[PDB]
């Protein structure tokens, strides 16, 4: 009957598996039953009740010491956005850092009139980029250079427009008004059509490796094994030349050009998919049948979009545009909805990216701020100081040590033993200890050359690393802790800020 | 730490004699599990886990003080002053049952109750703490010139 | 001493925060024991008072260390004592320490055997009740 041989058989026996922790594989039917037909546990799940474990190896209970008040848990009473401590944002993925702020003005507030009493705001515009991918792309090419020269070059602007799907630029448009649905749909359709009429045939990436996430390890990913290969770069380049070999500088991406953004194709296809915005968001006249109704993203009648709701437009590679949304107010009551996800529409991703960070964007301040912030994750720092780096360009972490003022006393100054690090650089002691460290390193380089396709070369490099570590360690025990500090600062002030 | 051993032994004997044999050479991990559970305390069900310590305000019954018992006795002793088949099964003397409830009873047999329905059905600090820890309080609003009182919305 | 023994059912602190009414239950009204001194609130079909005295496996020779469910407060008979609190009553933190001791346990998950376990430390003894601290507003 109703696919009795097809909706049964446990959909290909549910031969797609997962992987939890210690290699245990579970079926998707089992996991779907766990989230669907196990609602008692879900009653606890939507109550944030604390339970606390017991120690299993203890004869007498003894509730295990936990600190569970994590950022998401404590933030459930806040409004708008959650709040973490940086380390918890480093965990739970959370790798899309903010690169720019903006606004979609109806009437732009003038500093004249009455302070700006004509300042009607339709949306608040924020742009977010994947910071590790921003580092890996814009940092190994545009890293260690003058940032003003980089942002002055029109090649950097072209590159941050081209590599936008690669960075996964997601734009959050938060409604600052009870906006009518038809007006917003017409405005977005008109703006995106205007930007589609100027989307010339331009450059897109091409795939260098297929597959990943086969239907047995849907929990797993291929990139850590790809980046921790026995030869890595050699293997990656070999894959590259067997398809699209990188022509650019140290960035990857082969960049096919022109035709990739076809005109009568995907551009016109997107000009039709935009026509199926006011017949997919505001269909035939019945404000209870319009898809976005009932949910908190609109009002009770569904006519207007409520103030505080946000629309998340993420530009995936291969022309994928993911439009999600999120209601406003208390985050403990916020509900997030996936609205649409289009794939293969290379004109939509390029048109949205041009509309946000183009030569004429929807907000020039947002485009300039995003293209200017992006060098901070490019230089291996992230937009917000999640790693608590003291040398951050903006929002640097402090050492937490009171600054010292030299007193006009004599009893405070004591001539103790060898318990001061060297602070005078360029002196005879520093120069002679640098010379002794130099001869120790030269002995290490000489000893690493006697340690005797690319996998055997990397094994030889590992053997040379072991011999160099042995010789350098013996030399550093011959020298002092000040020499250890000098080797540490020499290693620190020699690598590029990008981390290459 | 030998008391732990004797204790777990006692719990073992308890379960073994309580549930009719069923121990056997088999089910040894089950016996260890129930011994550990009864040693730690009482195994709660899910309904017992989500049961709130704070009772519902409608769940508090009335308990009359002595003056209110006197009012009841006066009202009952003031008030008044068909085929057997269809007659209800609860066909007793209403006045006699009412007066036999004004004496003895449950609402009238404390002799120490004082505003038992006005105190209670009212959140105290410990009950507010229990409700918040159970995730039952939606919003807390500090009010007053000293900000020492809250208006909790559950 | 009564607060540390968990023998206090209610603690009504008045507006001045220096005078308390201590509602301590009558002992046989402190828990569901089936003592005939109490009013027969709780009877089975045999017209017998219901006793809920679970034995303590850590102390079989001391019935006073056994476990018992506390009575419903509305069915309790309580002495209402008057206590003149000192001026450093909140600074000394005795009530704070009692509350922190009372709210530190209950409904602990046990991975060694499964199930949620209410620990014996979270349960009450024969005459031990849960202290209900209520403050009064002078306004």
């Amino acid at each position: 009957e109703a696919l009795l041989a097809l909706v049964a058989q446990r959909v290909a026996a549910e031969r797609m598996f997962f992987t939890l922790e210690d290699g245990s594989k579970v079926s998707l039917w089992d996991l779907q039953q766990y989230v669907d037909n196990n609602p008692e546990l879900a009653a606890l799940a939507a109550s944030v009740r604390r339970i606390a474990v017991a120690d299993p190896e203890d004869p007498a209970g003894r509730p295990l010491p936990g600190g569970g008040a994590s950022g998401l848990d404590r933030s459930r009473g806040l409004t708008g956005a959650a709040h973490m401590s940086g380390q918890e944002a480093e965990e739970l993925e959370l790798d899309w850092g903010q690169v720019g702020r903006g606004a979609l003005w109806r009437r732009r507030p003038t500093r004249w009139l009455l302070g700006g009493l004509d300042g009607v705001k339709d949306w608040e515009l924020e742009a977010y980029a994947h910071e590790p991918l921003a580092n890996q792309l814009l940092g190994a090419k545009y890293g260690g250079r003058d940032p003003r020269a980089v942002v002055a070059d029109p090649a950097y602007a072209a590159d941050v427009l081209r590599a936008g799907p690669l960075l996964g630029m997601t734009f959050v448009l938060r409604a600052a008004r009870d906006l009518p649905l038809q007006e917003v749909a017409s405005s977005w359709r008109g703006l995106l059509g205007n930007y589609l009429q100027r989307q010339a045939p331009l450059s897109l990436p091409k795939a260098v490796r297929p597959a990943h996430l086969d239907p047995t390890d849907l929990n797993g990913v291929a990139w850590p094994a790809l980046l921790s290969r026995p030869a890595a770069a050699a293997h990656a380049a070999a894959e590259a030349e067997a398809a699209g070999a990188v022509p650019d500088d140290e960035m990857g991406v082969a960049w096919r050009v022109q035709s990739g953004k076809e005109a009568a194709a995907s551009v016109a296809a997107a000009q039709q998919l935009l026509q199926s915005l006011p017949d997919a968001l505001c269909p035939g006249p019945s404000p209870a049948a319009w898809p976005l109704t009932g949910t908190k993203l609109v009002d009770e009648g569904g006519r207007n979009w409520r103030r505080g709701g946000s629309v998340w437009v993420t530009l995936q590679p291969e022309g994928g545009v993911l439009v999600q949304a999120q209601t406003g107010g208390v985050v403990g009551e916020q509900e997030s909805y996936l609205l649409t996800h289009v794939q293969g529409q290379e004109a939509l991703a390029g048109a949205v990216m041009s509309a946000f960070m183009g030569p004429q964007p929807l907000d020039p301040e947002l485009a300039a701020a995003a293209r200017s912030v992006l060098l901070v994750p490019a230089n291996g720092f992230t937009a917000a100081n999640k790693e608590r780096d003291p040398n951050h360009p903006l929002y640097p972490s402090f050492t937490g040590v009171r600054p010292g003022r030299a007193p006009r006393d004599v009893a405070a100054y004591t001539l103790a033993g060898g318990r001061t690090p060297l602070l005078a650089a360029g002196g005879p002691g520093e120069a002679k200890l640098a010379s002794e460290l130099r001869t120790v390193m030269e002995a290490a380089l000489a000893a690493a050359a006697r340690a005797e396709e690319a996998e055997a070369a990397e094994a030889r490099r590992a053997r040379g690393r072991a011999a160099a570590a042995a010789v350098m360690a013996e030399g550093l025990r011959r020298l002092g802790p000040d020499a250890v500090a000098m080797l540490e600062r020499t290693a620190a002030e020699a690598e590029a800020p990008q981390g290459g | 730490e030998a008391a732990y051993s004797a204790y777990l032994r006692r719990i073992a004997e308890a379960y073994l004699a309580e549930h009719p044999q069923m121990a056997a050479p088999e089910h040894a991990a089950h016996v260890a599990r129930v011994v550990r559970s009864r040693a730690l305390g009482t195994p709660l069900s899910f309904d017992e886990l989500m049961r709130s310590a704070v009772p519902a305000p409608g769940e508090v019954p009335n308990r009359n003080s002595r003056g209110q018992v006197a009012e009841q006795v006066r009202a009952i002793l003031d008030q008044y002053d068909a085929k057997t088949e269809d007659m209800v099964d609860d066909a007793f003397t209403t006045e006699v049952v009412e007066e036999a409830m004004a004496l003895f009873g449950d609402a009238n047999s404390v002799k120490t109750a004082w505003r038992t329905q006005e105190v209670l059905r009212e959140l105290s600090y410990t009950q507010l703490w229990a409700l918040v820890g159970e995730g039952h309080v939606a919003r807390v609003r500090f009010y007053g010139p000293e900000k020492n009182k809250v208006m909790a919305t559950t | 001493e009564l607060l540390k023994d968990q023998r206090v059912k209610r603690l009504v602190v008045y507006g001045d925060m220096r005078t308390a009414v201590v509602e301590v239950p009558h002992p046989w009204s402190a828990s569901v024991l089936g003592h005939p001194a109490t009013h027969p609130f709780y009877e089975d079909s045999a017209h017998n008072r219901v006793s809920m005295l679970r034995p303590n496996p850590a102390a079989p020779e001391d019935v006073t260390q056994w476990f018992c469910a506390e009575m419903p407060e509305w069915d309790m008979e309580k002495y209402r004592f008057y206590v003149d609190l000192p001026g450093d009553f909140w600074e000394s933190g005795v009530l704070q320490r009692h509350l922190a001791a009372q709210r530190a346990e209950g409904a602990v998950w046990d991975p060694a055997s499964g199930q949620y376990i209410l620990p014996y430390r979270a349960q009450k003894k024969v005459f031990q009740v849960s202290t209900e601290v209520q403050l009064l507003d002078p306004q």
Binding site: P39, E40 | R51 | V32, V50
Partner: peptide, 26 residues
């Protein structure tokens, strides 16, 4: 019976049906 008239009703034992009323009904 009386063992439900008081023992489980007045004494607030028998916690409210949440698992059964959520799985079998809802």
């Amino acid at each position: 019976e009386e063992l439900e008239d008081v023992a489980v009703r007045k004494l607030r034992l028998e916690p409210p049906a949440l698992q059964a009323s959520l799985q079998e009904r809802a």
